[PDB]
From Swiss-Prot:
One of its GO terms (cellular component) is host cell cytoplasm. Induction: Expressed late in the viral replication. SUPFAM superfamilies: Lysozyme-like. Signal peptide: none annotated. Belongs to the glycosyl hydrolase 24 family. It catalyses: Hydrolysis of (1->4)-beta-linkages between N-acetylmuramic acid and N-acetyl-D-glucosamine residues in a peptidoglycan and between N-acetyl-D-glucosamine residues in chitodextrins. It comes from Enterobacteria phage T4 (Bacteriophage T4). The gene is E. Keywords: Antimicrobial, Bacteriolytic enzyme, Cytolysis, Glycosidase, Host cell lysis by virus, Host cytoplasm, Hydrolase, Viral release from host cell. Optimum pH is 7.3. This is Endolysin. It is found in: Host cytoplasm.
Length: 164
């Protein structure tokens, strides 16, 4: 398992514009197009992202290219964030994947309220961190995915992803 396989499981793959769990236009492997309610706005964003007139549909290769870009952006975002970088650097490889997964899903503003969880992760208090992480809108709105990510933080293993 690696971060690409993990997020591919969590986000799926859809080649036509769809609405994500929050109702936002998205495509590919969880590539957010816009938070605007306008499908036309989403189609514009898609054409801009892909560099051709897509009419709301992309190829698998195009989806995988956006995915590579998005994963890279997520990781670089962590390394540029003064709050996140030290915790990330303190983690092992498997737990780093859990970190990237969360930032991929919610961005850095979205993890802003996780100060206490970050502290527990940095301290390697894994059970405590796991309990704290579940006290979140994140957990309540996407519990199956959050449980997988939390299990990954708790154990430092891929046990939650092994049965897909
Ligand atoms: C739980 C805080 C958001 C995810 C995260 C955890 C550790 C390091 C970077 C990012």
């Amino acid at each position: 398992m690696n971060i690409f396989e993990m997020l591919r499981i969590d986000e799926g793959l859809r080649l036509k514009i769809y609405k994500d769990t929050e109702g936002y236009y998205t495509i590919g492997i969880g590539h957010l197009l816009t938070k605007s309610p306008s499908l036309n706005a989403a189609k514009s964003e898609l054409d801009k992202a892909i560099g051709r007139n897509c009419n709301g549909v992309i190829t698998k290769d195009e989806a995988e290219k956006l995915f590579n870009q998005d994963v890279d952006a997520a990781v670089r975002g962590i390394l540029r964030n003064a709050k996140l970088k030290p915790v990330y650097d303190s983690l092992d490889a498997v737990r780093r994947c859990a970190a990237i997964n969360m930032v991929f899903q919610m961005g850095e503003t979205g993890v802003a309220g996780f100060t206490n969880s970050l502290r527990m992760l940095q301290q390697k208090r894994w059970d405590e961190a796991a309990v704290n992480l579940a006290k979140s809108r994140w957990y309540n709105q996407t519990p199956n995915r959050a449980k997988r990510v939390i299990t990954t933080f708790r154990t430092g293993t891929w046990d939650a992803y092994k049965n897909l």
